[PDB]
């Protein structure tokens, strides 16, 4: 499928609605969609691209940089998250950890 991923931002007040195929990390999609996203290793191997889910679902089977307690809240890594659903999510959520 190809689900809508509305990028919301707690600051400038962004609710940017984007479309993401079933086979593309949430990062690359919106990123090349006219939206410059925060990131670093782009390999599920750091926190730069951290995200805090609001409503929706993704797939986290390619990670292992990955606290069961952290992920239990709804935290995502945009550079490696496949929309398992229509996903609302807030970016720039890397300071919520540590």
């Amino acid at each position: 499928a190809t689900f809508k991923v509305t990028l919301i931002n707690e600051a400038e007040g962004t609710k940017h609605e984007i479309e993401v195929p079933d086979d593309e990390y949430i990062l690359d999609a919106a990123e090349e969609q006219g939206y410059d996203l925060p990131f670093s290793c782009r390999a599920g191997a750091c926190s730069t691209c951290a995200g805090k889910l609001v409503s929706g679902t993704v797939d986290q089977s390619d990670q292992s940089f990955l606290d069961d307690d952290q992920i239990e809240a709804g935290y995502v890594l945009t550079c490696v998250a496949y929309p398992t659903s229509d996903v609302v999510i807030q970016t720039h959520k890397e300071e919520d950890l540590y």
């Binding site: 390999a43 191997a45 750091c46 292992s64 940089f65 606290d67 069961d68």
Partner: protein
Amino acid sequence: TQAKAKHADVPVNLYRPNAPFIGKVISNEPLVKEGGIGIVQHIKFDLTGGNLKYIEGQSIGIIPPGVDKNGKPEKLRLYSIASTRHGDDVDDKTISLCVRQLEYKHPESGETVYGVCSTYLTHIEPGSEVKITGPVGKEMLLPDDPEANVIMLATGTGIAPMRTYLWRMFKDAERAANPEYQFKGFSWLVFGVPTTPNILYKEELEEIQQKYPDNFRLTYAISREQKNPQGGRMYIQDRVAEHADELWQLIKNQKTHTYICGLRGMEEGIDAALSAAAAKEGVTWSDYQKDLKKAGRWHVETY
């Protein structure tokens, strides 16, 4: 954190950046011999001074020293435990790491750059104080069933987690240190690497070979000195492709589990292989694989 331990039996995150555990280094020996490509070195920390717990398949965080290079405090860099839970000395006080030196020419100025952390570890000094972060892993847990079949597709320093898998399985010591797990099943490791002398842990994984013909099979992929009949250097994807039918046969078993680890981009070639060999029996490997993650039988960690 620190005292954060009250639930489950899997040691996960009994230590946090907000409560580092300054483990200390015991040894630090090469793993790529002369002729090899790059620097990859075995690093072993002592655990005394803390209550650090873990098992085989978990990840351990290392915190670098430094407060001046990008203004802010250094950040975590995660690594996979290269050792059983008991540690590398078959006790409970140690733990081993598999770290490659990261270097690349600058995107712009071409200057070779050295990753802060691994460049730290690789040149690390015995008894050099190192801050460790508790374990953070649950997607590469090793099942307690000796009967289970452990398929292991790793490249480069992705040989970490299979070492803990294979060590516990086939290490005499641990074999006696874990009487309640005498592996009688059949595990299979496909190992991709540029050079023979790049073959990390070769002279032990092969010792495990001649001793357990029936429980361990061992396939190298050496691109720089191995060619498929179609005239193309040997990558693990190429080795999988060669044994696709075989391998596909395995995972269709009931308790057969798969473990892939190593640098990102290894998984695409391998999904293509199983796909073709599985489609012949009529099935979408994407769908079949789609459902094996739910059943907890397909385990991927690629960084």
